[PDB]
Amino acid sequence: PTPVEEAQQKTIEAITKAINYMAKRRIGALLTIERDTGMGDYIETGIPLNAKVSSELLINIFIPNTPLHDGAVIMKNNEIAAAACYLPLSESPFISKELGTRHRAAVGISEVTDSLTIIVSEETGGVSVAKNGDLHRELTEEALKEMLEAE
Amino acid sequence: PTPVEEAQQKTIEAITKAINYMAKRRIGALLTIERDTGMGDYIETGIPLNAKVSSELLINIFIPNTPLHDGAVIMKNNEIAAAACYLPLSESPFISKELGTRHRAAVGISEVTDSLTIIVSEETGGVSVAKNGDLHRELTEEALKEMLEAE
Ligand SMILES: Nc1cc(-c2ccccc2)no1
Ligand SMILES: [Mg+2]
Known part of the structure; x- marks a missing residue:
């Protein structure tokens, strides 16, 4: 395998x-992976990290009631x-009515970029992905990993 | 002022x-600032971040029961x-006997480096600094700022 x-x-x-x-702990989360459409305008709305990825840092970021x-x-x-970045809210009618702002923000960024966004529901623990204006809900662990590998 | x-x-x-x-929330914390003595061997025991400093990230890191x-x-x-880096525990008999491993780790790294370490006590929220093998306890906000500026 190459280093990349x-x-x-x-x-x-x-x-x-x-x-x-x-997901297991009902920690709500909203994680957008930039692809070929640059997302600088949205990155600049947040707190800069420019940090190496780790599962530990990702988890620490989303703990409820933290900065x-x-x-x-x-x-x-x-x-x-x-x-802690802003994303635009989708007005799509294909977002389940019970879902809140994290899912609407995920679909919103997915309408104006080719990014892949993962959402964890704090209500149910369900995992979903937004891509190209569509929300795919209730993903298994295997399905999420396959989607990421394909991306 | 210059950029630096x-x-x-x-x-x-x-x-x-x-x-x-x-300090207000009595969140235990241990923060070592490397100076002239390189601390790569201790850095390598932790989770790599190479992150921009922000107050928000520092707080998120130390929330209890997190990775x-x-x-x-x-x-x-x-x-x-x-x-989440290892620091060596001091064996000094001259550390206040009510203090535990966070403070002993801070004094320990200060015995073998020129670093400055800040400690927040989970028991009291008291702020202390370890340098040169000594622990300076019960610092005011002004005292901590003076130490950081002097350093
Ligand atoms: N901001 C914040 C603080 C905490 C906490 C939890 C247990 C013990 C001490 C602090 N959780 O979130
Ligand atoms: Mg389904």
């Missing part, structure tokens, strides 16, 4: 471990660029 | 804001190098 490919695999393992930990937990984490390649 | 001086002051303000919040809260944060070159 190994680094990607490590980042995916770190994300999936953090998401699984948060960094409200808003989106935006990742650039193998780094956490910023936390 | 403005950056140093921003970091001092971020540190003091985090320490003040943790990153157990061990020292080590700062280097105006960044958070790593969290």
